[PDB]
Amino acid sequence: NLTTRTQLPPAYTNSFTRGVYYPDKVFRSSVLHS
């Protein structure tokens, strides 16, 4: 069907400091949590 849209090997990128989510639904202010 719609196979082979184009031909190219995948590239790679540096994610940096990305992908961090909120671990829990508890409000915390001015603190360091591990």
Place this chain on the structure above:
Amino acid sequence: SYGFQPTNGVGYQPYRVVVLSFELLHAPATVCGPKKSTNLVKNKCVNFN
């Protein structure tokens, strides 16, 4: 398949199971117990629920 017969022993009889799973210490709750709701007071040492 299960051969649930009325003549079968207690070991081989149908048994209905409901498992209730709930999670505490989480987001705002929706399902709650049948408890009343007293008015809200401020600047006064009081018990709260």
